[PDB]
Amino acid sequence: LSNQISGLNVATRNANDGISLAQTAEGALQQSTNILQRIRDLALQSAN
Amino acid sequence: VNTNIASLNTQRNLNASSNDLNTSLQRLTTGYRINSAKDDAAGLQISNR
Amino acid sequence: VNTNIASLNTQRNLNASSNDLNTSLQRLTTGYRINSAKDDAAGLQISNR
Amino acid sequence: VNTNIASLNTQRNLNASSNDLNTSLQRLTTGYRINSAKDDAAGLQISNR
Amino acid sequence: TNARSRIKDTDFAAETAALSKNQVLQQAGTAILAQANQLPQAVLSLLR
Amino acid sequence: TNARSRIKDTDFAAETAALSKNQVLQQAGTAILAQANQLPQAVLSLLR
Amino acid sequence: TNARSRIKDTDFAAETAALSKNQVLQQAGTAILAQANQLPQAVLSLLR
């Protein structure tokens, strides 16, 4: 049970690391979405 | 009861409530109930469109 | 959590809102929706011509 | 039962608990669970990078 | 824009109350933790 | 930075209880030594 | 002047939190010193 407890603790830590990684990925994707927003706005403005 | 204390349920509760506090803090400073982050991906798509 | 606080999303939003505040104040004091600066270079050329 | 006392298990436990106590005091006074010391070499890699 | 507000703009009339509740939870939980950290020292100092 | 916090910032809600527990064990060990070091004295002074 | 501001003017939107962290860490270190300077007294008074 102590081996199990240590495994669960290192699992909490690995899960938090993965959460942080996915958070960075989500931030990058958010910035990309704003970039695509600007691109579509520029395209519709390019009707000219 | 000396090699451990079962009071770490209070720890779990405080970590969870601090998570809710952080998310509500972000919601309040940004003005968006659904954050620009992952929260409510359906509402996120709706807002993006 | 004491060596750092995740509440600096508030600081990020403050910086963003200060930039929007600066550009809006500039727009209001020049009377031009697009500033004489970079903003909307296509509109800038339209205004120039 | 006089030339020595088998109670040195208590001394070993005291020594171990004092070592963990020094590590805990260092963690609280520094704010890092992964101390600047050797602890968690993988965590040390991650933190340094 | 009205739709974007109804789907995005936080009706923080309840979110400020929720935030105060979360802060209350923080202080209550740390009070409970500091109070429970005093049990073993007392029971051992009396039982020894 | 949030990743660095989740990987480095001590969640001292547990390390404080650990400090308290370790102080309990330290005091208990001191008392146990003080109690046990008197066993040979008593047995020799009473048996002789 | 904006250049000199961006290179000189303090972005205290984070330095205020840094100041709070520094004050908290100083108080914590003082409390830790006051707690630790009592260990040898107790161990010697109990073991003797």
From Swiss-Prot, chains E, F, G:
It is found in: Secreted; Bacterial flagellum. Phosphorylated on tyrosine residue(s). Belongs to the bacterial flagellin family. Flagellin is the subunit protein which polymerizes to form the filaments of bacterial flagella. This is B-type flagellin. It comes from Pseudomonas aeruginosa (strain ATCC 15692 / DSM 22644 / CIP 104116 / JCM 14847 / LMG 12228 / 1C / PRS 101 / PAO1). The chain holds residues 441 to 488 of 488 of the full protein.
